[PDB]
Design a protein around this ligand. Structure first.
Ligand SMILES: Cc1cc(N2CC[C@@](C#N)(C3CC3)C2=O)cc(NC(=O)Cc2ccccc2)n1
Ligand SMILES: Cc1cc(N2CC[C@@](C#N)(C3CC3)C2=O)cc(NC(=O)Cc2ccccc2)n1
Ligand code: PRO
Ligand code: PRO
Ligand SMILES: [Ca+2]
Ligand SMILES: [Ca+2]
Ligand SMILES: [Ca+2]
Ligand SMILES: [Ca+2]
Ligand SMILES: [Ca+2]
Ligand SMILES: [Ca+2]
Ligand SMILES: [Ca+2]
Ligand SMILES: [Ca+2]
Ligand SMILES: [Ca+2]
Ligand SMILES: [Cl-]
Ligand SMILES: [Zn+2]
Ligand SMILES: [Zn+2]
Lengths: 495, 488
């Protein structure tokens, strides 16, 4: 049974939920977590969708080494200046010192782009569109959080190289739209699409696009995924050059993107939809969508028939592409099974007892609302499908409502401060400068009016939304007062 | 095309094939290699099959950390002694030296089994059946070789814990049989199932089962996959215990297996089926089974005819997709037909489907099998039936050829001079063997090129060991026929 309450101690609730749902186990090293099957299956559902979608775009999967040489790691100055403090270094094998230290990838731009340089000789060798599913290591000494912010994590990183800026620009937004589909259609989490500010953009990149999710339980926002246009910044450093004989002699540098998505998805899903009974799985990613549990059973051969009827429902659901398990163990009581599968967030519990079997009916119990329904055996495939779809809509609708009551506009620093301290994220007119962003962080921390159990921190930028709530009026001032605003920018306390 | 010849410098042939088929690229860290999409797709076909099969056995996928602490790594002393010289160690982040060095997994027993000990708190928590698809590092300084022997490689590693030895022993063999299915049904590679000798078995395990494949062109054998029974060696160290259901208070240690299969699969496929034209893909793992190539698109051909040709190609494409044939239509106009013939030949695509304007106007096409190079003219209306047949025949042919090779090069010998002769003729030999470690080192020393090593004790030997037969050492009696050879 779950006893930690989400609105009381969020961090302890989160830890109880991810362990009792059998999603996470703690490793004997700090910041290292084990993905047990219940969580890994969500990642695999995400993988299946995104893999199919990028393959439609011409992207192919591959696998590049996990190690970088010091020489390659340092060829793009901005990139390495940003990643160097958290790059983990292998310096020996057994007791034998290595030829030279080699680094574990924090990201694979510097692993992959020397090979791209070899592969690009003429204009027809482009585009190059590669993806890999792998682990990366970002060894920060700040406090880790399972799924949300870890030293090692699973992800996918896509890397594409084009002869023209137009093709690259097109791909950046296509990928970002796929990440939005992952969050909104699979995980039932609404997100805000936008551009990262100058301060927050990928070091070494031209510009970074992003999707941002809002976690109302902490009132904080978090980046769900990211799609960068790298311009020619890496092609010039790694010599990814072609010669088009229609532009004789002139070396031409490829235009590049990289884009990434991680198992942070599963953490956001946990934080958004979880409740005080435990995890709540959107049916689109649930490892088990329907769990069948036999009740009653306090007369043999009926008990033998009851088990048979549970397996009948199981086969009927398997036949219609509903993912189903029959918890037929006798080693545990029906109540223990109810609790076990509620903790795990199974969308529907299918209860079968003797009376209902002899009456050609069953009971379906929805996990999002607890609502109980009696269904005729004949309708099992239809109604369950309906309920599954309805659950997915409900989860999304609720999450959407929370986002829209918690994201509002403010046009002055004082209104921004007050709204922010009330637990919301705010679209403000913004001049765009890094220095002004720093000042916003510092002063929104300095001026914070604390609300009970609210996070103590300054506001950061989240994204410049593609579709802001309001149109920037002509000659509007930034909240800094001294510069004209360039755009509405979403700000909030964030992970 | 391809210039280096397989029967000459095998290593240069191998290098040329793996790069010109766009399977491998060299990384700037000597000894590490890039798996380009042509190779990765083979790995993905193998994963699709194996994943489905083990999920039928109750096994579930997970992901454990890449890092091991010094204390967990050394708890099973045999295992750590075997792996310690090739464990890679992280000693700093940025410029900050780490407080304690952390190891990268060479294999995940010592990462997973503390968690297993936490998860088993009664007999009902068993069995535990977990698998992960991931990368491991074994940083030897020997000479690496793409696919076959690398410092970093992708694999799958399965780890199961049971209450009784009978369950564990059953799973060891089920997994070994799936590995043999990967090699024989998917990769068209015959293998020999057997048991490793005491000398060659997994350090810290009780016994190791294996499949061994034979590479005609080198005379050498290579281990394809392995399935180990760890017994209670690891559960005694990591305290994986449950209470006896019948005896109150009595704790019992779980029985464990682990089993692994790597991208070495691809290397063996390349070495067994490749020829002097390049890679040769078995249809069951070929990303592209049929490639459609328009020919004859000269300057004289009308726009009417050229667009009709392209549409004919797309219609073959649709038809082959409708019958589940993995087909690529290569309609690019900025590459010549000959370039495409060569490109897809080097990549080992099973069938090239040629359509020119005259063939379209004759309601037929040309299909060229990669393995034999035979050109067949096929009527349009039979495309789906014939190509399917040919794909099956290709898979059968590749297996039959390789099986003939194995039968040719795996013979029995009962004397040591006979063993030495057959071994230096480029074969592997089943010999009467006493099993002793010292005598295995002795065979290695005497047979040295290099000395032969133990490969497997075959489940099904070629000969019944005649009662009272003496080992090849001529000192102690033989316990079993053992396969020996020069090994990868
Ligand atoms: C789980 C996860 C996710 C992500 N990040 C990053 C942005 C991104 C997005 N979008 C990446 C592009 C894909 C993302 O998901 C980042 C991380 N660790 C870290 O920063 C390192 C660390 C470790 C412990 C504590 C604090 C920091 N850990
Ligand atoms: C690609 C691959 C495969 C395998 N091994 C092992 C046995 C096994 C089987 N069966 C594994 C249990 C599954 C296998 O495939 C082993 C390896 N590297 C190494 O030993 C490290 C190395 C590196 C350079 C030179 C020499 C040695 N590299
Ligand atoms: O780390 C990043 O954000 C980019 C996207 C994936 C690859 N590198
Ligand atoms: O390395 C090995 O041989 C065993 C089997 C896979 C995991 N550990
Ligand atoms: Ca599962
Ligand atoms: Ca950093
Ligand atoms: Ca620009
Ligand atoms: Ca110029
Ligand atoms: Ca207050
Ligand atoms: Ca491919
Ligand atoms: Ca060793
Ligand atoms: Ca005792
Ligand atoms: Ca004809
Ligand atoms: Cl056998
Ligand atoms: Zn400003
Ligand atoms: Zn002997």
């Amino acid at each position: 049974g779950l006893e930690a309450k989400k609105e009381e101690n969020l961090a302890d609730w989160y830890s109880q939920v991810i362990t009792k749902s059998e999603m996470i186990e703690y490793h004997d090293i700090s910041g290292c977590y084990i993905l047990r099957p219940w969580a890994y299956a969500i990642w695999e559902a995400i993988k299946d969708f995104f893999d199919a979608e990028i393959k439609k775009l011409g992207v192919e999967n591959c696998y590049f080494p996990m190690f970088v040489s010091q020489s390659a790691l340092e060829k793009e100055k901005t990139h390495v200046a940003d990643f160097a403090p958290e790059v983990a270094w292998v310096t020996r094998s057994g007791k034998t010192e290595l030829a030279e230290p080699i680094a574990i990838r924090p990201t694979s731009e510097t692993v992959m782009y020397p090979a791209y340089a070899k592969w690009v000789q003429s204009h027809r060798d482009l585009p190059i569109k590669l993806n890999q599913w792998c682990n990366v290591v970002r060894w920060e000494f700040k406090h880790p959080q399972p799924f949300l912010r870890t030293r090692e994590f699973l992800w996918q990183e896509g890397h594409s190289a084009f002869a023209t800026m137009e093709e690259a620009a097109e791909e950046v937004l296509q990928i970002l739209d796929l990440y939005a589909q992952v969050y909104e259609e699979l995980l039932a989490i609404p997100v805000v699409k936008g551009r990262k500010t100058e301060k927050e953009k990928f070091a070494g990149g031209d510009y970074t696009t992003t999707i941002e999710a809002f976690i109302s339980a902490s009132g904080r926002a978090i980046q769900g995924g990211t799609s960068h246009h790298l311009g020619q910044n890496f092609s010039k450093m790694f010599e990814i050059v072609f010669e088009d004989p229609k532009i004789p002699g002139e070396k031409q540098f490829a235009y590049q993107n990289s884009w990434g998505l991680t198992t942070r998805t599963i953490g956001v899903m946990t934080m958004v939809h979880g409740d005080n009974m435990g995890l709540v799985l959107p049916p689109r990613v649930a490892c088990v969508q329907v769990v069948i549990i036999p009740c009653g059973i306090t007369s043999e051969e009926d008990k033998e028939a009851l088990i048979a009827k549970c397996n009948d429902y199981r086969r009927r659901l398997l036949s219609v592409n509903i993912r189903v398990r029959a918890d037929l163990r006798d080693n545990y009581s029906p109540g223990w099974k109810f609790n076990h599968w509620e903790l795990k967030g199974v969308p529907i519990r299918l209860e079968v007892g003797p009376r209902d079997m002899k009456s050609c009916q069953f009971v379906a119990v929805r996990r999002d609302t607890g609502e109980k329904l009696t269904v005729a055996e004949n309708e099992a495939e239809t109604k369950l499908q309906a309920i599954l779809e309805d659950i997915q809509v409900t989860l999304f609708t609720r999450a959407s409502e929370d986002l829209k009551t918690h994201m509002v506009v403010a046009n002055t620093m004082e209104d921004f401060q007050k709204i922010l301290d009330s637990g919301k994220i705010v679209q403000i007119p913004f001049c765009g400068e890094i220095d002004c962003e720093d000042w916003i962080k510092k002063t929104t921390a300095r001026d914070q009016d604390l609300e009970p159990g609210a996070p103590s921190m300054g506001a950061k930028s989240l994204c410049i939304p593609f579709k802001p709530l309001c149109e920037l009026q002509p000659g509007a001032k930034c909240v800094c007062g001294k510069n004209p605003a360039k755009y509405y920018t979403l700000f909030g306390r964030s992970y």
